[PDB]
Symmetry: C2
Subunit: 326 residues, 2 copies
């Protein structure tokens, strides 16, 4: 069997406050590229690793990461060997993998379309795209002409939700944390309006300015004070898809008077709809009708920085790490 050096990003310890580079280290080991006898494991060479916000919670003790082992997360990989009938040497796959050059994956999606850049299978064609589609299309049951608000709108998820809303004929407003993200939202992603929540003294007032007749749909990435501001601005029968949250919420009585449906979901419950997502979004990508922006960090050695950078909000759009070229 092939035996190769394997660079890994190890969680050195659980993190309490500011996740920092020094909470991870690079370890170099030797791996044999062989399906373990008996198993239906898959042996892969990792090509891209996604840096996704949910991973931060996994660095603290609560399934969390383990000190001493590689970080894991969504990625794109090429199969080298397989004990699973459905994958063969040479297949391209996306799903959960290790933060390392080669992983052994236990019981993952096969990639069929390679006309698109492979990096997209960490964003629009991967979990963030499926998340936006599940929350917006499935949970909010949106209708043409409805008004839509997205918090953390410059994120991997939010930027898609906004474009999907536009594609449907909705009026769409986004919230973000810098001048440059706000301009990106309007100038690159086609949000009708956007605002820097940091510059507003009164979030409810600011939502009222952009939604004079109220909000039909909130794509919730934030919670707390932002949610309170959304609640008093919702239209009757308004819908809130609770995707992510980052202060006590005081305005829940608005759920009654406005008859709001507020509903949490997890993307992995909707993966049986992924083919039907690919059929909607792939042509849009081709017709240049849905755009995507991303920061690409190069090499595993840059991965600790990239991850801390994402957690920090120090980057524009989706953060990814390219593990190797080709």
């Amino acid at each position: 069997a092939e035996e190769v050096s394997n660079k890994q990003v190890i969680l050195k310890n659980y993190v309490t406050g500011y996740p920092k580079e020094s909470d991870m280290e690079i370890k170099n080991v030797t791996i044999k590229l062989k399906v373990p006898e008996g198993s239906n494991d898959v042996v892969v060479k990792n090509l891209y690793l996604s840096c996704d916000p949910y991973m931060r919670s996994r660095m603290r003790k609560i399934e969390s990461f383990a000190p001493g082992s590689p970080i894991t997360g969504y990625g794109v990989a090429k199969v080298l060997e397989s004990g699973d009938p459905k994958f063969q040497k040479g297949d391209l796959v996306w799903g959960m993998t290790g933060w390392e050059e080669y992983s052994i994956i236990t019981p993952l999606f096969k990639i069929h379309d390679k006309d698109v850049p492979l990096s997209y299978y960490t964003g629009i064609l991967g979990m963030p795209g499926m998340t936006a589609y599940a929350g917006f299309h499935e949970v909010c049951s949106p209708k043409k002409g409805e008004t839509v608000f997205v918090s953390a709108a410059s994120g991997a998820v939010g930027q898609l939700v906004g474009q999907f809303a536009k594609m449907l004929g909705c009026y769409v407003v986004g919230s973000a944390g810098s001048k440059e993200k706000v301009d990106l939202l309007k100038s690159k992603f086609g949000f009708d309006e956007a605002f820097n929540y940091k510059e507003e003294q009164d979030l409810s007032a600011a939502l009222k300015r952009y939604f004079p007749d109220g909000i039909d749909i909130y794509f919730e990435n934030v919670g707390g004070k932002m949610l309170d501001a959304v609640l008093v601005n919702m239209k009757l029968y308004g819908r809130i898809a609770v995707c992510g949250m980052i202060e006590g919420v005081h305005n829940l009585f608005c759920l009654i008077t406005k008859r709001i449906r507020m509903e949490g979901f997890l993307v992995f419950d909707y993966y049986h709809l992924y083919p039907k997502y690919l059929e909607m979004v792939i042509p849009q990508i081709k017709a240049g009708k849905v755009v995507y922006v991303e920061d690409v960090a190069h090499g595993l050695e840059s991965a600790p920085t990239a991850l801390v950078g994402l957690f920090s909000g120090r980057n524009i759009g989706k953060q990814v790490v390219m593990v190797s070229r080709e």
Copy 2:
């Protein structure tokens, strides 16, 4: 037209904290029992008035007006009508004034008086329709699911528990006294119940009653109770947000902290108002009335007598003096 003296319960001032009896007064006016010449109004004699917790909010600056009668749901007899739908002698229920006689702009006609008329302020009126629409529709309940009902001895929660039981759900209720807890289990057939005041830790109390979590929360209370439920919900759990009674007498609301559970447990938490479900009211009556007459569905109300008791009845409600649904009888007829 007949002209009669008309006692009225007037809101004297907007209310700060818990209402007191002195926030209201009895006034006596002369009323002409006549349909205003242009209108399709109905002239009614009021027989029963409901005391409902949502009224407490209407007492602060839709809101009630200082100097004017309190208004709310009641049961009344038609004396004169400018509306072909309603005839002299009809019994109706709907919004009316806290007074002996009201002029209403059309309101449900009552057909069955083989039940107590007071029932049309509760089990057969708005609270019963709320329990029905909230549990039967909003909660999408299934046999064998676990159900928690806050303010369970209240007018709405006491029905929710019995509906859940009829479906074969396992049902637990919270109330604010030993007497109300005993009632939930002995009369309303809740599987368990507890006095919220006697629990050091609501989250741990709910874990004890629901080892595997709560499928359905019928929410009447809000606040720390909701936070304790959130951490105890099952996967794809549902919360019908009906009322938040713990919140109505506060200058500012309490912060809810556990909404991250909506994500982890994929909960649907949905507000609703009975106004949107009155299309199901004929279905609800035709189901519930046979059950009432068979003693398969039970109700507990308190009936205070005379308009002069209404302030005390209303204040009492807001502070838990009543067992079950509070009503005021204005008159017999």
